[PDB]
Design a protein around this ligand. Sequence first.
Ligand SMILES: Nc1ncnc2c1ncn2[C@@H]1O[C@H](CO)[C@@H](OP(=O)(O)OC[C@H]2O[C@@H](n3ccc(=O)[nH]c3=O)[C@H](O)[C@@H]2OP(=O)(O)O)[C@H]1O
Length: 190
Amino acid sequence: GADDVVDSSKSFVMENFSSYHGTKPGYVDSIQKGIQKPKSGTQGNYDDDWKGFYSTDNKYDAAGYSVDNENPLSGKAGGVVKVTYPGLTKVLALKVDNAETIKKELGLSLTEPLMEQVGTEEFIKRFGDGASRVVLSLPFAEGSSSVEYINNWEQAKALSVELEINFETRGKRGQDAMYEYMAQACAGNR
Ligand SMILES: Nc1ncnc2c1ncn2[C@@H]1O[C@H](CO)[C@@H](OP(=O)(O)OC[C@H]2O[C@@H](n3ccc(=O)[nH]c3=O)[C@H](O)[C@@H]2OP(=O)(O)O)[C@H]1O
């Protein structure tokens, strides 16, 4: 039953659906060249069902992903990008963060990565209400008002990328400076 795995009151189709991704040091300027997948093993998540490009509504929540990854001792940080999907995208809010119950209640092949299947013409079509693509959605983290957007890997390519902020210039001061940034919410969510 689709109904008990997807929250319909938090799904919608949208013109130019933007979300933010956190980019590590190095990798800022090539990600503004664009999204396409990593060859170095991870590609999104440990479990196959869930590999895809991960983004969020909240740029602040995005910003703390722009840090470290073999050495937190250099206080650097890359920046945040606003990635944006051209035109018409659905966002299917899952009410269940668990893949075989997601594949079974939605009636999806019981033995694929679910993010492989979100990719198909048959999923875009069947669930996208006329959308060029579907992005899944589960919240951010416990008790947080932000959602997390799991983008399919192929449908993700066709995203475009602008710099939201870039801590990669402050080398040693990047991570410190980032706190200041994340301190704008309590001061600018208003
Ligand atoms: N041009 C590029 N195109 C595509 N991706 C690129 C590109 N260049 C660099 N990447 C990186 O490749 C991974 C793709 O998601 C991310 O790095 P990470 O350090 O593994 O990022 C670490 C983790 O943070 C997650 N994550 C990152 C940012 C964010 O906003 N939210 C989030 O959940 C990733 O899902 C990843 O999860 P897993 O470690 O569980 O794989 C990303 O920064």
